[PDB]
Amino acid sequence: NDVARGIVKADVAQSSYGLYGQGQIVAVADTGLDTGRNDSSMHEAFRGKITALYALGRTNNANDTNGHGTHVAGSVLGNGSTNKGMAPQANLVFQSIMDSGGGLGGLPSNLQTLFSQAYSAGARIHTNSWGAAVNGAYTTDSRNVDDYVRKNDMTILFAAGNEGPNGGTISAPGTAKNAITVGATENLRPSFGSYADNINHVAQFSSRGPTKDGRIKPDVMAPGTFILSARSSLAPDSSFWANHDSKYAYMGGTSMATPIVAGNVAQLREHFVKNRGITPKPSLLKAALIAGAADIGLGYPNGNQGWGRVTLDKSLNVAYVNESSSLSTSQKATYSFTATAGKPLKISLVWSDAPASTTASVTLVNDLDLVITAPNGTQYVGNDFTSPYNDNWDGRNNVENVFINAPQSGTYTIEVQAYNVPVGPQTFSLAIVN
Ligand SMILES: [Ca+2]
Numbered sequence: 547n548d549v550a551r552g553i554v555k556a557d558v559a560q561s562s563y564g565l566y567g568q569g570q571i572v573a574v575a576d577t578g579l580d581t582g583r584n585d586s587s588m589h590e591a592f593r594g595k596i597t598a599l600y601a602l603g604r605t606n607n608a609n610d611t612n613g614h615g616t617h618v619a620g621s622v623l624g625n626g627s628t629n630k631g632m633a634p635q636a637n638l639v640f641q642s643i644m645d646s647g648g649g650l651g652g653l654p655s656n657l658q659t660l661f662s663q664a665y666s667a668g669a670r671i672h673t674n675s676w677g678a679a680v681n682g683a684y685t686t687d688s689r690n691v692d693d694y695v696r697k698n699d700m701t702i703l704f705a706a707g708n709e710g711p712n713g714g715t716i717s718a719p720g721t722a723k724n725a726i727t728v729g730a731t732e733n734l735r736p737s738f739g740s741y742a743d744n745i746n747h748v749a750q751f752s753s754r755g756p757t758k759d760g761r762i763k764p765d766v767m768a769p770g771t772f773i774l775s776a777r778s779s780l781a782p783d784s785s786f787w788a789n790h791d792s793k794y795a796y797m798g799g800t801s802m803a804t805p806i807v808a809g810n811v812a813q814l815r816e817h818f819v820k821n822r823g824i825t826p827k828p829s830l831l832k833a834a835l836i837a838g839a840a841d842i843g844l845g846y847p848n849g850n851q852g853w854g855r856v857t858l859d860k861s862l863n864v865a866y867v868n869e870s871s872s873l874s875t876s877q878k879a880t881y882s883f884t885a886t887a888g889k890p891l892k893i894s895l896v897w898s899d900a901p902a903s904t905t906a907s908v909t910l911v912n913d914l915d916l917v918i919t920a921p922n923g924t925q926y927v928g929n930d931f932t933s934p935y936n937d938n939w940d941g942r943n944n945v946e947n948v949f950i951n952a953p954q955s956g957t958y959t960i961e962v963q964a965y966n967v968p969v970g971p972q973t974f975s976l977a978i979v980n
């Protein structure tokens with residue numbers, strides 16, 4: 547965590563903007579949490595900050611004999627003396643889903659029940675380092691995530707899976723359109739070797755897109771190797787990649803990258819609520835993370851890195867649209883933005899789409915298109931990264947981006963076009979970085 551904090555610029559958010567996640571509640575569904583008791587026996591990283599601790603997989607036992615859930619929660623918000631999480635003043639809702647067999651049998655058949663329970667406790671961010679290796683398929687769980695996000699303002703994150711490096715290996719429910727799906731780059735701890743030596747390396751095991759219907763997943767990346775975080779007092783050494791001390795130890799996986807981003811989302815949500823005066827929709831938090839992310843060097847579009855590695859300080863200051871307009875087929879929304887040469891111009895359009903059928907060959911339901919016109923008349927369409935930039939239109943993704951590395955100074959015209967909206971109207975969010 548301490549190194550990952552610097553990589554994703556959570557340090558700048560903390561020290562310069564004062565964003566520690568205070569007043570935000572993050573829910574974690576994972577194996578268990580240290581002793582499983584909300585009392586003075588609990589690990590220092592979480593003692594005193596647990597809103598609710600629910601035992602789903604084993605009756606009245608939310609402890610963590612595995613160590614995965616304690617480590618994950620630690621990276622979101624641990625507030626122990628060392629190795630803090632990204633949002634150490636956020637409060638925790640923990641749903642213990644591990645069963646007596648070490649399986650994830652505490653998950654309900656309808657995931658909306660899981661999310662509802664956490665929502666009723668106050669959580670508005672829900673992070674999940676679990677999934678099924680279904681090679682990019684959109685399953686009933688994916689459908690249920692998408693319906694839940696469209697109806698409730700809960701931001702839900704899923705790990706991409708650990709079945710890389712082959713393409714097409716994204717886990718479900720990480721294949722959901724309306725979730726933020728997170729893959730893993732490397733942490734910078736090079737004395738541990740090649741898995742932790744270049745922050746612009748995708749971790750070899752991180753699952754890679756596209757999804758079965760051709761969408762870009764994961765959405766964003768964060769460090770996921772040799773992450774030092776909270777060690778459950780009941781977990782054995784074999785659960786960790788390396789020891790550190792009795793209270794903290796190392797783990798790696800897309801399970802580790804996901805909670806780092808969840809904590810960053812709590813910092814970003816805090817910023818919008820306290821400093822920008824709005825409650826941001828899930829689509830806007832997603833668009834802000836994507837517009838601010840860094841190309842790790844592979845270029846776009848790319849199923850290995852998605853839209854790049856989270857860079858939180860860029861995401862804080864975006865110009866935005868927060869689901870303030872909704873469109874039906876053939877309508878358009880038009881905005882103007884004055885850009886400065888000298889810094890890249892990145893514009894991201896994101897919408898929480900209608901859930902698809904699991905029998906559909908194409909999961910996108912409502913198709914919006916992003917069209918940007920530059921001061922000298924050049925036009926750019928969403929996700930077209932080959933010149934000319936206005937001949938390849940996107941009909942698959944519910945994220946569309948226009949990234950211009952060397953913009954003209956002057957006013958750009960931003961149009962959001964409703965190409966086909968059968969389940970309308972459809973709202974959207976926009977985030978602009980310059
Ligand atoms: Ca490496």
Ligand SMILES: [Ca+2]
Binds near residue numbers: 913939943946
């Ligand atoms: Ca489109």
Ligand SMILES: [Ca+2]
Binds near residue numbers: 930931933935
């Ligand atoms: Ca093109």
